[PDB]
Design a protein around this motif. Structure first.
Motif, mmCIF file in Angstrom:
data_model
loop_
_atom_site.group_PDB
_atom_site.id
_atom_site.type_symbol
_atom_site.label_atom_id
_atom_site.label_comp_id
_atom_site.label_asym_id
_atom_site.label_seq_id
_atom_site.Cartn_x
_atom_site.Cartn_y
_atom_site.Cartn_z
ATOM 1 N N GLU B 194 -89.738 -30.684 -6.360
ATOM 2 C CA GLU B 194 -89.040 -29.981 -5.296
ATOM 3 C C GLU B 194 -89.136 -28.484 -5.543
ATOM 4 N N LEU B 195 -89.381 -27.730 -4.476
ATOM 5 C CA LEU B 195 -89.447 -26.277 -4.543
ATOM 6 C C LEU B 195 -88.156 -25.700 -3.979
ATOM 7 N N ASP B 196 -87.383 -25.037 -4.831
ATOM 8 C CA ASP B 196 -86.139 -24.423 -4.402
ATOM 9 C C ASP B 196 -86.432 -23.083 -3.731
ATOM 10 N N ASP B 197 -85.379 -22.380 -3.345
ATOM 11 C CA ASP B 197 -85.544 -21.086 -2.696
ATOM 12 C C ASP B 197 -86.046 -20.064 -3.709
ATOM 13 N N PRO B 198 -87.215 -19.454 -3.497
ATOM 14 C CA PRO B 198 -87.731 -18.493 -4.485
ATOM 15 C C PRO B 198 -86.839 -17.282 -4.688
ATOM 16 N N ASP B 199 -86.108 -16.856 -3.655
ATOM 17 C CA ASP B 199 -85.266 -15.671 -3.774
ATOM 18 C C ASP B 199 -84.142 -15.858 -4.782
ATOM 19 N N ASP B 200 -83.850 -17.099 -5.177
ATOM 20 C CA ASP B 200 -82.874 -17.340 -6.232
ATOM 21 C C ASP B 200 -83.331 -16.796 -7.577
ATOM 22 N N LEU B 201 -84.634 -16.567 -7.755
ATOM 23 C CA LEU B 201 -85.127 -16.041 -9.021
ATOM 24 C C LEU B 201 -84.804 -14.566 -9.205
ATOM 25 N N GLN B 202 -84.452 -13.858 -8.134
ATOM 26 C CA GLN B 202 -84.118 -12.445 -8.248
ATOM 27 C C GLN B 202 -82.830 -12.273 -9.041
ATOM 28 N N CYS B 203 -82.861 -11.383 -10.028
ATOM 29 C CA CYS B 203 -81.702 -11.098 -10.855
ATOM 30 C C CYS B 203 -81.503 -9.593 -10.946
ATOM 31 N N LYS B 204 -80.238 -9.181 -10.996
ATOM 32 C CA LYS B 204 -79.884 -7.765 -11.072
ATOM 33 C C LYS B 204 -79.799 -7.373 -12.541
ATOM 34 N N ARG B 205 -80.879 -6.788 -13.049
ATOM 35 C CA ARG B 205 -80.938 -6.298 -14.420
ATOM 36 C C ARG B 205 -80.827 -4.779 -14.400
ATOM 37 N N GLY B 206 -79.791 -4.253 -15.048
ATOM 38 C CA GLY B 206 -79.525 -2.831 -15.001
ATOM 39 C C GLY B 206 -78.937 -2.413 -13.671
ATOM 40 N N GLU B 207 -79.710 -1.669 -12.879
ATOM 41 C CA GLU B 207 -79.285 -1.272 -11.545
ATOM 42 C C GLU B 207 -80.325 -1.567 -10.474
ATOM 43 N N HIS B 208 -81.459 -2.162 -10.834
ATOM 44 C CA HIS B 208 -82.514 -2.491 -9.888
ATOM 45 C C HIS B 208 -82.853 -3.970 -9.990
ATOM 46 N N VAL B 209 -83.353 -4.519 -8.889
ATOM 47 C CA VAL B 209 -83.852 -5.888 -8.838
ATOM 48 C C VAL B 209 -85.370 -5.804 -8.774
ATOM 49 N N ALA B 210 -86.032 -6.221 -9.855
ATOM 50 C CA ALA B 210 -87.485 -6.101 -9.930
ATOM 51 C C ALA B 210 -88.173 -6.972 -8.887
ATOM 52 N N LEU B 211 -87.638 -8.161 -8.631
ATOM 53 C CA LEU B 211 -88.241 -9.099 -7.695
ATOM 54 C C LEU B 211 -87.786 -8.879 -6.259
ATOM 55 N N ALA B 212 -87.104 -7.772 -5.976
ATOM 56 C CA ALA B 212 -86.705 -7.470 -4.609
ATOM 57 C C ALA B 212 -87.924 -7.135 -3.761
ATOM 58 N N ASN B 213 -87.950 -7.673 -2.540
ATOM 59 C CA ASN B 213 -89.072 -7.492 -1.617
ATOM 60 C C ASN B 213 -90.389 -7.924 -2.258
ATOM 61 N N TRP B 214 -90.355 -9.051 -2.973
ATOM 62 C CA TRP B 214 -91.536 -9.518 -3.688
ATOM 63 C C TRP B 214 -92.656 -9.943 -2.748
ATOM 64 N N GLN B 215 -92.347 -10.217 -1.481
ATOM 65 C CA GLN B 215 -93.379 -10.599 -0.526
ATOM 66 C C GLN B 215 -94.235 -9.422 -0.079
ATOM 67 N N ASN B 216 -93.819 -8.188 -0.372
ATOM 68 C CA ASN B 216 -94.645 -7.033 -0.036
ATOM 69 C C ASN B 216 -95.928 -7.004 -0.857
ATOM 70 N N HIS B 217 -95.938 -7.663 -2.011
ATOM 71 C CA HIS B 217 -97.138 -7.790 -2.827
ATOM 72 C C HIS B 217 -97.870 -9.062 -2.422
ATOM 73 N N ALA B 218 -99.122 -8.911 -1.984
ATOM 74 C CA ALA B 218 -99.860 -10.045 -1.439
ATOM 75 C C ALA B 218 -100.142 -11.098 -2.504
ATOM 76 N N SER B 219 -100.438 -10.672 -3.728
ATOM 77 C CA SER B 219 -100.849 -11.586 -4.785
ATOM 78 C C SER B 219 -99.685 -12.111 -5.616
ATOM 79 N N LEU B 220 -98.451 -11.739 -5.289
ATOM 80 C CA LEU B 220 -97.285 -12.182 -6.041
ATOM 81 C C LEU B 220 -96.749 -13.485 -5.462
ATOM 82 N N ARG B 221 -96.423 -14.429 -6.341
ATOM 83 C CA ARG B 221 -95.816 -15.694 -5.955
ATOM 84 C C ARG B 221 -94.626 -15.984 -6.857
ATOM 85 N N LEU B 222 -93.616 -16.635 -6.287
ATOM 86 C CA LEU B 222 -92.418 -17.030 -7.013
ATOM 87 C C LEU B 222 -92.319 -18.548 -7.012
#
Lengths: 292, 259
Positions: B194-222
């Motif tokens: 089963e594939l869960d919601d990929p946006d659940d992988l986003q975590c707030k580390r420090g003050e930025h979310v590295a995986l925020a707007n991850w779909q803007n990168h064409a070659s990135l997959r979660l």
């Protein structure tokens, strides 16, 4: 020097100091033979030393004696390479032999001081039979104010395991005695296995009492570290392919009861020698560095 | 329901049971009687396959829990929590090590339960599991399904724990009700999962979310996997309401429960 006095000196130095090992006694006898040889050529010197080594290995069928013999022959060969004149070479040899004896006499304490730090508080140590180097490392570990329980195997053909248990209870270390067949039963209670070796072969394996291979295989099956504490002068350039490939002069006379077995380097985690803490692959390198 | 979320193995077995029970309803049966019998059959199925099964598994697991042992558990499992709670109640004294993984962090649930039962508990994440297994005596794992070849389908990271426990010479025990046994076989986690919601992988580390707007990168997959498969060679024992069995006996149960 006659053959009879050679055997007499070997036996006397073995009996006088039971703490000192057979290889050290053999090397001491060879150096004492070289001390008073009344010869003039290094060729006859090498031949006489080789014959002395054969008769000494006739006295004792241990691998360590032959190890010391080859090591001593290499020492003479190197010394001869250094100096061509027989008198200067011989005096260089006697001083170098005295220094060599001094250095090999204190290898045990170096191994103990380098290996006692691998024992943890509350650990359970399994060992095979009597080995003075393991006694020394356990004594050093106790002197480090560490508490551990030692298991030992009775070592059936000669109950040197009971002797190990007595020499360990002498210092009130909690020890237990199990049969040769109970080793596979005990592995899961122990934390690590520490054994000695009568000879360290080229590829990093060891030659030891007949029950060592069982412990190595059981420890590998149960993911337990297998530590071998051994001296430098037990480095034979032998390459056994299996148990049958071990020379027969070491198996017997020391239905069919072999006295030694060979343990592959893949079953050994680390070797604790006076050179340091080594992987088995280092040992071969040493030998390659010795014989040019 | 499958469109809302893929069905679990327990739900598949429940659907099979209910379809078989509805098919068994005779045409001559009165509608009210048929409906009442269907509801009673559902109630009886719940009772036998959940409550009595859990009680039997707790009694069976009581014999495998001794004084002073350390038990390692993973995520959230009601059966595991009940087993530990009744073992503590009957008089066993021990401590539990709870292992958790992102992003669901269901293990916290179990932690709370243990704290409310008086059982000493420890908490850590899955990457640190190899650190704590030296002091662990037994590993108690829940199962989402048992497959016909003896494999254990469970939350992702269970096979990880089984492998690391085998590396440390720690027995691995699996508790599972027999109604979660499946006739299908599965060799890996890729063919069925089963594939869960990929946006659940986003975590707030420090003050930025590295995986925020991850779909803007064409070659990135979660990738958010839900389940994994543990081979039968990594499992030492299965505790069921029938008793303590090897994994190889999972098809045998499937043979005796069917007929």
């Amino acid at each position: 020097m006659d053959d009879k006095e050679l055997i007499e000196y070997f036996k006397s130095q073995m009996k006088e100091d039971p703490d000192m090992a057979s290889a050290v006694a053999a090397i001491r006898t060879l150096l004492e033979f070289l001390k008073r040889d009344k010869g003039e050529t290094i060729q006859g010197l090498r031949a006489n030393l080789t014959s002395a080594i054969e008769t000494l290995c006739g006295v004792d069928s241990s691998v360590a004696v032959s190890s010391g013999g080859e090591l001593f022959l290499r020492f003479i060969s190197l010394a001869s390479l250094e100096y061509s004149d027989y008198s200067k070479c011989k005096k260089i040899m006697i001083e170098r032999g005295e220094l060599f004896l001094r250095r090999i006499s204190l290898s045990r304490n170096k191994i103990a001081d380098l290996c006692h730090t691998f024992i943890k508080d509350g650990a359970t140590i399994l060992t095979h039979a009597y080995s003075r180097v393991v006694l020394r490392v356990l004594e050093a570990a106790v002197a480090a104010k560490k508490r551990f329980s030692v298991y030992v195997t009775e070592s059936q053909p000669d109950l040197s395991g009971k002797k190990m248990a007595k020499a360990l209870c002498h210092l009130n270390v909690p020890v237990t005695v199990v049969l040769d067949a109970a080793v596979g039963y005990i592995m899961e209670k122990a934390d690590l296995v520490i054994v000695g070796a009568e000879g360290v072969v080229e590829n990093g394996g060891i030659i030891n009492k007949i029950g060592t291979n069982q412990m190595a295989v059981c420890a590998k099956a149960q993911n337990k570290p297998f530590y071998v504490v051994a001296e430098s002068f037990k480095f034979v350039r032998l390459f056994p392919l299996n148990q049958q490939d071990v020379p027969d002069k070491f198996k017997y006379k020391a239905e069919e009861h072999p006295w030694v077995d060979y343990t592959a380097p893949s079953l050994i985690t680390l070797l604790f020698t006076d050179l340091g803490v080594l992987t088995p692959s280092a040992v071969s390198d040493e030998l390659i560095k010795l014989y040019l | 329901l499958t469109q809302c979320r893929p069905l679990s193995a327990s739900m598949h077995n429940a659907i099979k049971f209910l379809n078989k029970e509805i098919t068994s309803v005779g045409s001559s049966k009165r509608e009210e009687e048929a409906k009442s019998e269907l509801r009673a059959a559902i109630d009886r199925y719940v009772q036998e396959k959940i409550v009595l099964a859990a009680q039997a598994i707790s009694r069976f697991a009581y014999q495998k829990i001794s004084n002073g042992d350390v038990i390692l558990v993973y995520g959230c499992s009601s059966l595991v929590s009940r087993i530990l709670q009744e073992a503590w109640t009957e008089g066993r004294r021990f401590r539990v090590v709870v292992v958790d993984s992102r992003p669901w962090l269901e293990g916290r649930h179990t932690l709370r339960s243990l704290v409310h039962a008086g059982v000493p508990a420890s908490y850590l994440l899955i990457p640190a599991a190899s650190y704590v297994l030296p002091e662990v005596s037994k590993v108690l794992l829940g199962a989402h399904a048992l497959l016909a070849n003896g494999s254990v389908m469970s939350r992702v990271g269970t096979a990880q724990l089984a492998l690391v426990a085998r590396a440390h010479n720690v027995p691995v025990l699996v508790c599972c009700e027999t109604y979660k046994f499946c006739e299908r076989v599965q060799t890996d986690a890729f063919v069925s999962n089963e594939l869960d919601d990929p946006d659940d992988l986003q975590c707030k580390r420090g003050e930025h979310v590295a995986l925020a707007n991850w779909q803007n990168h064409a070659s990135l997959r979660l990738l958010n996997l839900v389940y994994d498969v543990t081979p039968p060679e990594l499992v030492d024992l299965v505790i069921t309401e029938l008793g303590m069995i090897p994994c190889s006996s999972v098809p045998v149960v499937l043979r005796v429960k069917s007929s």
